């Protein structure tokens, strides 16, 4: 009775299909999952994808001549829309095929089994709003520490903790812990819940999605917050959902120190370059040696079979002299996540974790032998050291 017939602007269409196509699976056991769902009605077109784990859905303006729904190959539609000329795109469902016309280019794709296509999950009740940029930044700063699929499930996720208008993101891989606290706007009072989101999915949603100024997080309301089984993210005309992890996150807080025996403040860029130079001779990028004394940092690394490098930097150091080694890659990951012009290190023992956090004027107001109370910060990158011979 009704077959979708719609006219669209190329940019809106190609961009929408592009964003939705990122959540598409490759060679899924369920063929229909490889399709993109197009639903045109009133004066808009909705473009959707789903893989039983992540859902992507975006609505764009559209000139509807006939509403309807159709399921077409996702990657193929994405490629076509990329390659279309900057002209109006006419889409018309005809029988078992879908005509797509743009200028002189004409495509005829076969329709997929929209009957066997699963229903998209409905986002839980809205829980709060978060500034888009800050949310994406926090995610980026924490995801660096998340474990990869090789490790246990609990480590492959970003823990999202909400307590009123303050939320904390945490991720660890058993060697580095990243924690970021930020302020948000809760649409429910005195909420207190914690969930575990797949780190890859959340980081992806941050990099590619999260358009606009504010982002609405949907985990539920009242007591059902976080118990709905999925995280919803709505921003502008985009909405996505992610299945949550059932695994329980480690009690990461009892890894953080209360005081430091030594403190060291230095410029992020300077330290990063020096680390990148010295690390070129580490046997497997495995170990860089840091020697703090007076106000000097002696970096070193290497073997006699590969080579031996070293470099001295000026450092604002206070406390007991220290010699501690780290993984060069892990170290540069932390420094890269700080997003500060200057870093402060908090040390206890060469065999215990080190605290990497942005520097503050208070740090420059220290001149005692220690110990030093662990200051409160918005972001912390705790890095476990490497044993020394």
């Amino acid at each position: 009775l009704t077959d979708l017939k719609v006219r669209l602007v190329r940019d809106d269409f190609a961009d929408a299909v592009a964003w939705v196509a990122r959540s598409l699976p490759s060679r899924p056991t369920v063929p229909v999952l490889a399709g993109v769902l197009l639903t045109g009605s009133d004066d808009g077109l909705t473009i959707s994808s789903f893989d039983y784990e992540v859902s992507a859905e975006v609505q764009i303006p559209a000139e509807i001549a006939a509403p309807g729904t159709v399921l077409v190959s996702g990657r193929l539609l994405s490629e076509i829309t990329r390659a279309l000329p900057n002209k109006p795109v006419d889409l018309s469902v005809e029988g078992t095929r879908v005509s797509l016309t743009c200028g002189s280019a004409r495509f005829s794709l076969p329709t997929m089994a929209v009957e066997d296509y699963p229903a998209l999950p409905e986002l839980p009740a809205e829980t709060g709003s978060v500034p888009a940029d800050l949310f994406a930044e926090a995610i980026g700063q924490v995801a660096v520490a998340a474990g990869r699929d090789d490790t246990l499930p609990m480590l492959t996720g970003i823990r999202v903790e909400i307590s009123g208008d303050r939320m904390v993101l945490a991720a660890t891989d058993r060697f580095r812990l990243a924690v970021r606290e930020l302020t948000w706007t809760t649409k429910t009072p005195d909420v207190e819940a914690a969930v575990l989101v797949p780190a890859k999915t959340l980081a992806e949603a941050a990099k590619t999605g999260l358009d606009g100024s504010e982002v609405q997080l949907a985990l539920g309301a009242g007591p059902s917050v976080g118990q709905d089984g999925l995280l919803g993210i709505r921003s502008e005309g985009k909405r996505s959902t992610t299945r949550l992890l059932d695994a329980e996150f480690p009690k990461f807080r009892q890894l953080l120190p209360t005081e430091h025996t030594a403190m060291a403040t230095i410029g992020v860029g300077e330290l990063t370059e020096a680390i990148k130079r010295v690390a070129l001779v580490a046997d497997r990028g495995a170990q860089v040696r840091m020697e703090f004394a007076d106000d000097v940092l002696h970096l070193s690394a290497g073997a006699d079979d590969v080579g031996r490098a070293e470099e001295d930097l000026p450092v604002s150091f206070s406390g007991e002299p220290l010699t501690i080694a780290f993984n060069p890659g892990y170290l540069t990951d932390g420094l890269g996540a700080l997003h500060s012009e200057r870093v402060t290190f908090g040390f206890t023992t060469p065999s215990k974790p080190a605290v990497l956090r942005p520097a503050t004027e208070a740090d420059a107001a220290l001149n005692g032998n220690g110990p030093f109370p662990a200051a409160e910060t918005d972001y912390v990158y705790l890095l476990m050291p490497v044993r020394l011979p």
Binding site: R174, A286, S351
Partner: peptide, 6 residues
């Protein structure tokens, strides 16, 4: 390399 826990 040492672990944070375990």
């Amino acid at each position: 390399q040492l672990p944070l826990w375990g």
